[PDB]
Amino acid sequence: FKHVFVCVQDRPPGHPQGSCAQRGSREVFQAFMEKIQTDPQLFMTTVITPTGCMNACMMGPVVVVYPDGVWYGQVKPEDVDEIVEKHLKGGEPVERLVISK
Amino acid sequence: AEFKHVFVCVQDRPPGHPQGSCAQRGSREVFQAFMEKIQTDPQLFMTTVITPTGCMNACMMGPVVVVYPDGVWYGQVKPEDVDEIVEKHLKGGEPVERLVISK
Ligand code: FES
Ligand code: FES
Ligand SMILES: [Zn+2]
Ligand SMILES: [Zn+2]
Ligand SMILES: [Zn+2]
Ligand SMILES: [Zn+2]
């Protein structure tokens, strides 16, 4: 079972650290939702949840996978397929995008 | 201690939604209570993150709070229940059995 949390926080223009929504995170969340709902093996063992800020803004979009405790930063919508394949199904975090475990 | 990450569903929905929402069931005050505690309390602030979320799909048992990496899901959480969760589980390591809906 894996629980993926995608920060979809938005903030007005002048916020110094920006926000994950401004960096494209609402498209990352939608991509995860589409993949999980259309994949038989993931649909019954994975939950995707949109969240407010998780305090790692400069590294957004931020995605955290529990219970593993893997934090990903700078996730682009194009990277969602790799995370789903290699980590959510494969059990191997996408090293290139990990910012913490 | 270690590190705990608390997620509080703060999703709100228009009045007609069959399953209601956690915000309709008082979850934003539960989130606010966690925030007030996690920081007026040093031991907690340093080791805990409280994050508000959208629906976690267990609406009829809300307000829904999930603590990771433990994987403890709580339901029907009231603001008044926050101190017990903070003391027993977030500081003490022991989930509040009466509110657990899943581990
Ligand atoms: S806005 Fe997403 S981690 Fe802060
Ligand atoms: S509205 Fe909170 S779990 Fe659905
Ligand atoms: Zn509805
Ligand atoms: Zn409302
Ligand atoms: Zn109190
Ligand atoms: Zn018992």
| CATH number, domain containing residue B41 | 3.40.30.10
User: Using what technique was this structure determined?
Assistant: X-ray
Cis peptide before A67 (omega within 30 of 0): yes
Residue among B74, B82, B92, B68 nearest B29 (CA): B82
Residue among A79, A78, A61, A49 nearest A24 (CA): A61
Residue among B59, B83, B102, B54 nearest A67 (CA): B102
Annotated binding site of A for [2Fe-2S] cluster: 7, 20, 53, 57
Domain count, chain A: 1
Yes or no, beta carbons of A51 and B56 under 8 Å apart: no
Give the count of beta carbons closer than 10 Å to the beta carbon of residue A50: 22
Contact between B5 and B69 (Cβ < 8 Å):
yes
Please give the backbone phi and psi of residue A83, each rounded to the nearest 5 degrees, phi first. -60, -45
Nearest CA in chain A to B72: A67
Q: Which ligand has the shortest distance to the CA of B11?
A: 2
Residue among A15, B69, B89, B3 nearest B77 (CA): B89
Nearest CA in chain B to A67: B69
Yes or no, beta carbons of A64 and B7 under 8 Å apart: no
Distance of CA A98 to the CA centre of its chain: 11
Give the structural domain span for A98. Answer: 1-101
B35 exposure class (CB count in 10 Å sphere: 0-12, 13-18, 19+): middle
Q: Which ligand has the shortest distance to the CA of B12?
A: 4
Yes or no, beta carbons of A69 and B71 under 8 Å apart: no
SS3 B99: helix
* B14-27 CB burial, b ≥16 within 10 A, e <16: eeeeeebbbbbbbb
| β-strand partners of B51 | B7
For residue B40 the two structure tokens come to 């007026």
